[PDB]
Design a protein around this ligand. Structure first.
Ligand SMILES: [Zn+2]
Ligand SMILES: [Zn+2]
Ligand SMILES: [Zn+2]
Lengths: 45, 47, 41, 47, 69, 344, 98, 44, 244, 304, 103, 49, 24
C-alpha cells in the first residue's frame, strides 16, 4: 500500500492530492518519501 | 584606444591596404608571412 | 645552407625570446634598477 | 607501549553514546571564542 | 562503514574476522600482536586492516527514520 | 571504507578525528618501475581499486520550486503528478504516481525527474536532470509551506547519489605534500611481488623526493610497517626525537626484532619478467588522502554546434558544449611558426 | 637563523620556526611573479607583428618599410648555428656530413 | 520530445523540430537547418 | 596541441595521432613536457584537429615537434628525456652491465620494432659479444652501439663524438675515465650517458645526431631510448631507501 | 641444442606442506619465465565463480545500493568451476543467463525491535540485525537439482558481515553468479596469493669459529645456522627456513666474511587460496591452461 | 567448421621473402606467453633472433620476431617452440601429479 | 613516439575530417560508412554533390 | 631529555612461507 514516512515521528503517512502537507500525528510540514518494491540491477568491481 | 584611432583614420580617409597580420585577419585575408607571402601558380600543359 | 629561410617570422621570435624568459627574473637582488621594471623603461 | 588506537573505547562510544559528558573536550574549546562571544550579547554583568 | 571483505593487496577474505576480533580484546584482554595473529592474519597488508578499521557504521545506525524516536 | 593513521600524533585523539576519518592506508613501494609515473604522477593498483580503494561518492540536492514563479495572489496553478489528455509512457518507469521519482532509480540527462501537470496548458511538462553524470535519487523530501497550513506543495527537494570511483587522473596526496595524479591503473599481476606476496598499492616516484625534501614520508613508511606488524600505533608528534635519537635508529630496533631488514628495505621481485630486481625495495604503509577535485569534471570535446547571432561563433559552457578559445598569444604563435594555413 | 639541524634527524623548534619564515617569502614571491611578464610579450607583438625576412634577405615590416638589411647582420638561422662554428666536430665527421 | 513550433525546409514535409547538438537543430533525418543563431549569455 | 600559457611558440606544436583504447585522458611523452613546460599535476591543454590539406602539411612540416628541437631563443634544445631514464641510463652505460645473449636481443627488440617500422635496414642486426671464452656476455655500451646502428641510415657512416659528463671521474674508483664520453664509428667506446647526453643539453650525442643525421633521426632516437630504459627499468628497477 | 627431455631430468618438485587452503611446493631447475607463466595464470587466467549482477528488489538500509552490490561480488562463493559453462553476453537477457551458466542467489533479511532488558548489546536488542553472508540462499533454477545433491551452493567464508540493520529496514535482492577470470575483475581471483620466492644461498667465506659464530645466530632467523665448537664451527641447516633479512650486512665485522644470494633455479611456490578451490588443483589449472594456450596458437592458421 | 584466423596474425611488411625473418602480431596476449615462448624459442640452436615486444600494454598485443640462420623459416621455428612449450607441460604435470600422490 | 599524442575513444568518435572521395580512398571510405560513429575506423555524416 | 621509550616485549613477526612458529 502506497505510503511515505514522517520526518519527526516516523508515521507512514499516505498522501492523496488536495490534502494538507502536514503529518497526521505531528503537524510537521517536512515529510520524506519512502521506497516501494521495484527491480533495479547493478554491476560489481 | 580603438575608437581614438578610428576617429583619426576616418579623418584620414585611410585607404588601408590590408598588409599587416593585425589587419589581414580582420578581413580574413591570407596572412603575408611564411606560407602566405607568395602565390602558387599551376602551369597547365596545353594552350 | 644554414641561412635564414626568407618569409621567416623574425618579429615574433624577437619578442618570444624576450617575453618568454622574462617570466623567470622578478626575484630578489643577488643601486641598479633590475629585471622587469628596468626593462619596462 | 608508545600510544594507542582505542579499538574497544571507540566501539563502546559508537554503540553507546556518552549520556553524561561530551568526550574530546578540546574540540569544544577550539570553537569556544565564537560561542563565548555570542553568549556575551545577552548574558554577563549588566546583561 | 563496515569491515572490508577482502584485503586491498593480497586477496584473502577479511570481513569474517572483525566481530570475531573484538572477542579477543573485550574478553581475553589480548594485545593486538597476538589478537591479529591468533585469527590467521600473518601478512601485514592484511594485518593493518583488522587492526586499523574505524567501523563508523554504528554512528550511522543511530540515525534511523524507520523507527519511532 | 576509510581507516585511521597508524602513524599519528597524540593531539589527534584529544580532538578525536576518529569521528571524522579522512584517508586510508596504502602499501607503498618507493620505486620507479613503470615509467608511467614521472612529473609527480603515481600508479594505483588495479585489484586494490577493484576491491575498493578510496571508493568515494558524492551528493548534491536540488530545489524544485513552482512558487518561485508564483505571485502572491497567483492561485495554485501547477501541480506535481501527471494529468489527463495525455499518455506518454516510460515516465511511469522513472517516476511514481505523484510525479516524484522512485528513490534509487538510475537517471541520466534526458530523463524525467518530476511530473508537474499544469492547468493553463493541459499537458505534463516534465523537467529533466540538468547534468551529465550517472546519478541516482538518494532521498526525496516533500516540503510543506509556511504562511498557511493546508495548500498543496510547490517545493520539493531531491537528493542525488553520484558515484565516483578512483578513475585515472583522480588526485592523491599523503600527509606531507606529495600530491600526484593517478596515472595508470596498472594490473596487479604485473606489479612487483615481494618475498611473501605483498604487492604494492600505490607506486610512488623516487624522483619526486630530492627536490621536495619530504623526509617525514621517508620515516612514516618505515614507522607504518613498524606499527602494522607489532600492533602499536607510533606517536609522530614533532620534536620527540632528538638528534642523538635518530628515528631510523628508533624504528630500526623494531624491524630488526620483527624480521624485516633494518633499513626499511624489502627485496621485491619483478612482475613483468619473473627475475629478481637488483636493489632492495623500500616498502611500507603510508597514509594517503584522496582529494576533492578530480578530472572527471574537467575534460570536454566539441566538433560542431551552437553558433551565436552577433558573431556566428561557437558557444561557451561545459554543460553547454563549450568551445575551445584560440586567443591572443595563440594567434601570435601560429604566426611565429610561419604557418598561415594553420591560422587561416 | 643559522640552523645546525639536518632533515635526517630533524630540526629544533626554534630553527623550525625560522625555516618556516623562509617558506613564506618563497610563497609571497610566486603570488607576485605571475602578473608582471604579460604586458611585455603582447606589448612587443603589436609592432614586431609582420616583420619578416623578405626574399632579398632584408628585414622589412610587411608595409614595405625596412628596418635591417640582413637578419642581425650575418642572417643565420638560430636553430641552425649550433655546429656552424664547431670546427673540430665537422672535421671529425666529414664523410657523413658531406 | 518534439515541440509545437515551426515548419522548415529540406523538403521532407511540413515538419517539426527538436535540438540535437543544442543549436544546429535538425529534422527527423538529421538534415541541418541552414543558419540558426542560438541566443545565449554567459554568467560572470 | 596547446598549453594555455603560450609564452614560447613551442607550446604550440603538432602530433601524429595514435588513438589509444581503454582510456579517457590525453597521453603525452616526456620529450614533449620539457617543451610545453607542463608537469603532470593535471593541466588543461587544448587540442586542435585541422580540417583541410593546406593545413595538414603545415602541421607535418612547419610546426611539428621535430623541427622545434632547438629553441629559437638562443638555440638550446627543449626536447629530451627528463627524470626516469636519465638516472636509469647511468646504470646501463655503467661498466657492470653484463647482459646475456637472450636479454641482448630483448632489450634491443623491446625498443626497436621493424613491424611498427622503426629501423632502416629492414632486419635487426646484432653485434658480436664482448666476452667469448667462459660465457658469452654483452655490454650496455654495446646496446647504445646497436641502437645507433639501427635507426640511422646506412648510406652515411658512423658517428664520432667527444663529450663530457656531470659525473666527476673519481666516483668510479682510481681515476677512471668515465667522464670523457667518446663516440667513435658509431659506438659507445667510453663514457656514461647522462643529462648532458640526452636531455635538453647542447652538444650532446642526441644533439650530435640532430646535426649530422638531420632532425628526423635524433627525434626518432629518443623514441627508441624512451622504449629502451623503460623495458630496462621494468626488468630491473631503481628505488631510494632510507639508508641512502 | 637443448633437448626438452633433458629438462625432465632437471625438474624436481618438493611439496613441503599441502593443506586444503595453502600448498607450499618447490620447483627445481625451471626458468623465471616459465615459472612466472605458471604464476601468471594462477592469479588471472584461472576461472572462478562470483557475481557481477545484483538485482535489488528492496533495500532501505544504511549501506546503499552499489556498495552492498559491491560487497556481495567480493564474496568467494564455494562453487566449483567446470560445473558451469561460459556466458555468451553478446545477446540480451532472454538467453544470456541460462540455467547452466548462472547460479542464482537471494537475500531476505528483516530487522525488528526485540524487547530485552539491560549500554546494550545489538544482537539481543534486535532480531536479525547483522546481515551475515551465510544468509545467501541458492535458488535451484532449472535442472540444477539432479546433480547438486552433493555440491550445494554454500559460500566459502560464511561469517562475512554484509550489512547492519535497524528496525524497519530490510534487504531483498537477487544475485546471479557469473563464471569469470581475474583479468576482468579482481573478484574472480581463485587465490589468496599465489606467489613464489627464491631459495637463498648463504656462503661463509672466512671461518667464523667461536665468538664470531655465536653472535652470528642473531643476524639470522634461528633454525638456519648450526655452530658447535671449534670443530663444527658453523654450517647452514636449511636456508629455505631463512627469509632474506640482510641483518648481517649491517655489521662491519661480518660485511666481508659472507655471501648472500639466491639459488636461481629453486622456486618455492607457496600458493594459498581464497576458498573457492584447493591450491594443489588450481596449479593444475595452470599447467593445463598454458598447454591449452599454445594449442590456440599452434593449431591455428597463420594469417597472411 | 570455423577457423579463428585472427590469433597468429603474421605481419608482412617486416617479413623476409624467404621466411627466415618473420613478423607476427599476436592478440589475446601480453607478457604471459610472451616470455614463456621467448625462452623456449632461444633454446633452438637454429634461431638467431627472438625477442617479444609490446607496443602499448593497454590492449592485447605481442609482436614477437623470430630470425634464423638457415634452412628453417621463422614460422617453422615458431612451431617447434610451441611444440616444446606444450611438452614442458607434459613434464610439469607428471612430476607434480607424482608428488601429490606420493605422500 | 615523441612526435605523437595518445587519444581516447571519447575524442575519437567526435572529431571529423571532410575527406573527399576518389578511386584510391574508396577502399577505406566504404568501410568508413559501414562502421558509422559506433566502431572507431568509421565516419559520421556524408555529403552528396 | 628522556628518550623515546623503547617498547618492551616485541617478537619475530615474519617467517618463512611454510614455516610459521617453530623457532624458539
Ligand atoms: Zn508525524
Ligand atoms: Zn592481505
Ligand atoms: Zn526534401
Amino acid at each position: 500500500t502506497l505510503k511515505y514516512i514522517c520526518a519527526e515521528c516516523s508515521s507512514k503517512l499516505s498522501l492523496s492530492r488536495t490534502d494538507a502537507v502536514r503529518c497526521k500525528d505531528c503537524g510537521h510540514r517536512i515529510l520524506l518519501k519512502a521506497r516501494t518494491k521495484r527491480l533495479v540491477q547493478f554491476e560489481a568491481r | 584606444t580603438t575608437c581614438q584611432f578610428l576617429t583619426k583614420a576616418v579623418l584620414d580617409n585611410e585607404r588601408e591596404q590590408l598588409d599587416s597580420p593585425s589587419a589581414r585577419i580582420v578581413v580574413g585575408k591570407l596572412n603575408n608571412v611564411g606560407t602566405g607571402s607568395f602565390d602558387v601558380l599551376a602551369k597547365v600543359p596545353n594552350a | 645552407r644554414s641561412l635564414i629561410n626568407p618569409g621567416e617570422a623574425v618579429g615574433i621570435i624577437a619578442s618570444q625570446s624576450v617575453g618568454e624568459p622574462s617570466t623567470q627574473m622578478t626575484l630578489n637582488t643577488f643601486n641598479v634598477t633590475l629585471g622587469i621594471p628596468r626593462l619596462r623603461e | 607501549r608508545t600510544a594507542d588506537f582505542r579499538t574497544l573505547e571507540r566501539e563502546s562510544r559508537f554503540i553507546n553514546p556518552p549520556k553524561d559528558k561530551s568526550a574530546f573536550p578540546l574540540l569544544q574549546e577550539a570553537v569556544q571564542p565564537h560561542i563565548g562571544s555570542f553568549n556575551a550579547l545577552t548574558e554577563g554583568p549588566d546583561g | 562503514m563496515i569491515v572490508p571483505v577482502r584485503c586491498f593487496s593480497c586477496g584473502k577474505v577479511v570481513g569474517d574476522k572483525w566481530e570475531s576480533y573484538l572477542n579477543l580484546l573485550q574478553e581475553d584482554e589480548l594485545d593486538e600482536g597476538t589478537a591479529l595473529s591468533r585469527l590467521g592474519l600473518k601478512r601485514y597488508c592484511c594485518r593493518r586492516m583488522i587492526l586499523t578499521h574505524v567501523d563508523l557504521i554504528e554512528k550511522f545506525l543511530r540515525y534511523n527514520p524507520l523507527e519511532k524516536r | 571504507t576509510g581507516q585511521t593513521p597508524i602513524v599519528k600524533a597524540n593531539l589527534y585523539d584529544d580532538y578525536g578525528m576518529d569521528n571524522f576519518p579522512n584517508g586510508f592506508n596504502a602499501v607503498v613501494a618507493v620505486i620507479s618501475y613503470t615509467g608511467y609515473d614521472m612529473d609527480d604522477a603515481m600508479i594505483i593498483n588495479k585489484s586494490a581499486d577493484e576491491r575498493g580503494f578510496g571508493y568515494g561518492t558524492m551528493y548534491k540536492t536540488e530545489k524544485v520550486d513552482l512558487a518561485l514563479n508564483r505571485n502572491r495572489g497567483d492561485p495554485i496553478t501547477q501541480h506535481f503528478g501527471f494529468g489527463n489528455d495525455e499518455w506518454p509512457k516510460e515516465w511511469l518507469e522513472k517516476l511514481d504516481e505523484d510525479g516524484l521519482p522512485y528513490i534509487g532509480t538510475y537517471v541520466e540527462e534526458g530523463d524525467p525527474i518530476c511530473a508537474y501537470f499544469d492547468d493553463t496548458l493541459n499537458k505534463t511538462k516534465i523537467k529533466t536532470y540538468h547534468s551529465s553524470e550517472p546519478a541516482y535519487i538518494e532521498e526525496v523530501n516533500l516540503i510543506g509551506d509556511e504562511s498557511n497550513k493546508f495548500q498543496e506543495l510547490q517545493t520539493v527537494s531531491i537528493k542525488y547519489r553520484i558515484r565516483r570511483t578512483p578513475q585515472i587522473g583522480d588526485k592523491f596526496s599523503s600527509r606531507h605534500g606529495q600530491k600526484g595524479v593517478c596515472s595508470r591503473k596498472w594490473p596487479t599481476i604485473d606489479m612487483p611481488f615481494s618475498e611473501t606476496g605483498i604487492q604494492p598499492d600505490i607506486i610512488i616516484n623516487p624522483h619526486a623526493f630530492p627536490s621536495r625534501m619530504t623526509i617525514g614520508m621517508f620515516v612514516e613508511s618505515l614507522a607504518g610497517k613498524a606499527g602494522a606488524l607489532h600492533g602499536i600505533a607510533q606517536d609522530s608528534t614533532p620534536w620527540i626525537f632528538n638528534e642523538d635519537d635518530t628515528p631510523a635508529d628508533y624504528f630500526g630496533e623494531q624491524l630488526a626484532k620483527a624480521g624485516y631488514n633494518y633499513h626499511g628495505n624489502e627485496p621485491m621481485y619483478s612482475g613483468a619478467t619473473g627475475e629478481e630486481l637488483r636493489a632492495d625495495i623500500y616498502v611500507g604503509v603510508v597514509y594517503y588522502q584522496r582529494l576533492r577535485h578530480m578530472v572527471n569534471d574537467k575534460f570536454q570535446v566539441r566538433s560542431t554546434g551552437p553558433v551565436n547571432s552577433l558573431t556566428m561563433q561557437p558557444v561557451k559552457g561545459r554543460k553547454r558544449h563549450g568551445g575551445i578559445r584560440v586567443g591572443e598569444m595563440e594567434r601570435d604563435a601560429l604566426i611565429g611558426h610561419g604557418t598561415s594555413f594553420l591560422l587561416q | 637563523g643559522y640552523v645546525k639541524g639536518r632533515f635526517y634527524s630533524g630540526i629544533k623548534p626554534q630553527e623550525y620556526y625560522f625555516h618556516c619564515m623562509a617558506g613564506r617569502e618563497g610563497l609571497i614571491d610566486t603570488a607576485v611573479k605571475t602578473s608582471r611578464s604579460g604586458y611585455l610579450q603582447r606589448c612587443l607583438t603589436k609592432q614586431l607583428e609582420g616583420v619578416h625576412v623578405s626574399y632579398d634577405n632584408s628585414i622589412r615590416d610587411a608595409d614595405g618599410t625596412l628596418v635591417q638589411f640582413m637578419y642581425g647582420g650575418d642572417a643565420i638561422d638560430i636553430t641552425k648555428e649550433s655546429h656552424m662554428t664547431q670546427f673540430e666536430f665537422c672535421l671529425d665527421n666529414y664523410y657523413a656530413l658531406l | 520530445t518534439f515541440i509545437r513550433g515551426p515548419i522548415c525546409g529540406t523538403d521532407n514535409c511540413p515538419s517539426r523540430l527538436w535540438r540535437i547538438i543544442d543549436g544546429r537543430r535538425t529534422c527527423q533525418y538529421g538534415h541541418v537547418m541552414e543558419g540558426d543563431v542560438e541566443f545565449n549569455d554567459d554568467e560572470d | 596541441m596547446n598549453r594555455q600559457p603560450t609564452l614560447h611558440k613551442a607550446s604550440m606544436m603538432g602530433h601524429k595521432v595514435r588513438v589509444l583504447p581503454n582510456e579517457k585522458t590525453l597521453r603525452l611523452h616526456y620529450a614533449n613536457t620539457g617543451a610545453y613546460n607542463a608537469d603532470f599535476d593535471g593541466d588543461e591543454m587544448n587540442m586542435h584537429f585541422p580540417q583541410n590539406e593546406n593545413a595538414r602539411a603545415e602541421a607535418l612540416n612547419l610546426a611539428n615537434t621535430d623541427s622545434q628541437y632547438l629553441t629559437p631563443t638562443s638555440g638550446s634544445p627543449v626536447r629530451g628525456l627528463i627524470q626516469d631514464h636519465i638516472s636509469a641510463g647511468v646504470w646501463l652505460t655503467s661498466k657492470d652491465s653484463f647482459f646475456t645473449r637472450e636479454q641482448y636481443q630483448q632489450y634491443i627488440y623491446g625498443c626497436i620494432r621493424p613491424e611498427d617500422g622503426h629501423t632502416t635496414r629492414s632486419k635487426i642486426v646484432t653485434l658480436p659479444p664482448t666476452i667469448f671464452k667462459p660465457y658469452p656476455l654483452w655490454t650496455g655500451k654495446q646496446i647504445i652501439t646497436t641502437v645507433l646502428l639501427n635507426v640511422t641510415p646506412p648510406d652515411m657512416p658512423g658517428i664520432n663524438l667527444i663529450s663530457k659528463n656531470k659525473i666527476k671521474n673519481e666516483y668510479w674508483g682510481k681515476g677512471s675515465l668515465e667522464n670523457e664520453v667518446l663516440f667513435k664509428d658509431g659506438a659507445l667506446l667510453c663514457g656514461i650517458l647522462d643529462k648532458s647526453q640526452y636531455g635538453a643539453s647542447k652538444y650532446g650525442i642526441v644533439h650530435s645526431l640532430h646535426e649530422v643525421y638531420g632532425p628526423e633521426v635524433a627525434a626518432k632516437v629518443l623514441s627508441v631510448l624512451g622504449r629502451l630504459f623503460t623495458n630496462y627499468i621494468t626488468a630491473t628497477a631503481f628505488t631510494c631507501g632510507m639508508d641512502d | 641444442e637443448w633437448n626438452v627431455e633433458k629438462f625432465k631430468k632437471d625438474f624436481e618438485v618438493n611439496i613441503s606442506s599441502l593443506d586444503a587452503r595453502e600448498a607450499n611446493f618447490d620447483l627445481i631447475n625451471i626458468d623465471t619465465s616459465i615459472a612466472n607463466a605458471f604464476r601468471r595464470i594462477m592469479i588471472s587466467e584461472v576461472p572462478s565463480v562470483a557475481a557481477e549482477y545484483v538485482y535489488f528488489f528492496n533495500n532501505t538500509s544504511v549501506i546503499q545500493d552499489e556498495v552492498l552490490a559491491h560487497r556481495i561480488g567480493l564474496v568467494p562463493l564455494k562453487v566449483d568451476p567446470d560445473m558451469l559453462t561460459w556466458v555468451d553476453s553478446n545477446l540480451p537477457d532472454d538467453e544470456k543467463f541460462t540455467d547452466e551458466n548462472t547460479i542464482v542467489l537471494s537475500l531476505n533479511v528483516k530487522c525488528t525491535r526485540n524487547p530485552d532488558a539491560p549500554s546494550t548489546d545489538p544482537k539481543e536488542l534486535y532480531n536479525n540485525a547483522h546481515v551475515y553472508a551465510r544468509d545467501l540462499k541458492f535458488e535451484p533454477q532449472g535442472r540444477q537439482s539432479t546433480t547438486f545433491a552433493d555440491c550445494p551452493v554454500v559460500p566459502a567464508d560464511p561469517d562475512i558481515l554484509l550489512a547492519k540493520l535497524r528496525p524497519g529496514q530490510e534487504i531483498s535482492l537477487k544475485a546471479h553468479c557469473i563464471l569469470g577470470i581475474g583479468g576482468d575483475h579482481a573478484k574472480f581471483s581463485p587465490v589468496s596469493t599465489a606467489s613464489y620466492r627464491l631459495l637463498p644461498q648463504i656462503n661463509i667465506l672466512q671461518p667464523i669459529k667461536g665468538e664470531s659464530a655465536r653472535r652470528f645466530q642473531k643476524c639470522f632467523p634461528p633454525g638456519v645456522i648450526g655452530i658447535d665448537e671449534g670443530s663444527d664451527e658453523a654450517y647452514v641447516k636449511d636456508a629455505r627456513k631463512d627469509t632474506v633479512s640482510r641483518e648481517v650486512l649491517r655489521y662491519e665485522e661480518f660485511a666481508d666474511k659472507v655471501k648472500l644470494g639466491r639459488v636461481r633455479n629453486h622456486f618455492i611456490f607457496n600458493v594459498e587460496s581464497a576458498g573457492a578451490m584447493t591450491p594443489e588443483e588450481i596449479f593444475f589449472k595452470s599447467v593445463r591452461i598454458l598447454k591449452n594456450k599454445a594449442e590456440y596458437l599452434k593449431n591455428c592458421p597463420i594469417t597472411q | 567448421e570455423e577457423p579463428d584466423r585472427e590469433k597468429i596474425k603474421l605481419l608482412t611488411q617486416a617479413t623476409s621473402e624467404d621466411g627466415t625473418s618473420a613478423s607476427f602480431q599476436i592478440v589475446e596476449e601480453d607478457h604471459t606467453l610472451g616470455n614463456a615462448l621467448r625462452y623456449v624459442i632461444m633454446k633452438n640452436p637454429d634461431v638467431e633472433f627472438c625477442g617479444y615486444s609490446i607496443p602499448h600494454p593497454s590492449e592485447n598485443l605481442l609482436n614477437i620476431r623470430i630470425q634464423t640462420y638457415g634452412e628453417t623459416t621463422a614460422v617453422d621455428a615458431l612451431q617447434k617452440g610451441l611444440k616444446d612449450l606444450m611438452d614442458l607441460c607434459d613434464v610439469v604435470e607428471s612430476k607434480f601429479t607424482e608428488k601429490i600422490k606420493s605422500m | 613516439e615523441t612526435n605523437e599524442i595518445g587519444v581516447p575513444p571519447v575524442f575519437a568518435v567526435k572529431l571529423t575530417y571532410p575527406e573527399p572521395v576518389t578511386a584510391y580512398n574508396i577502399a577505406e571510405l566504404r568501410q568508413a560508412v559501414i562502421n558509422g560513429p559506433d566502431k572507431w575506423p568509421g565516419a559520421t555524416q556524408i555529403q552528396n554533390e | 631529555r628522556k628518550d623515546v621509550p623503547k617498547v618492551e616485549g616485541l617478537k619475530l613477526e615474519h617467517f618463512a612461507t611454510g614455516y610459521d612458529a617453530e623457532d624458539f
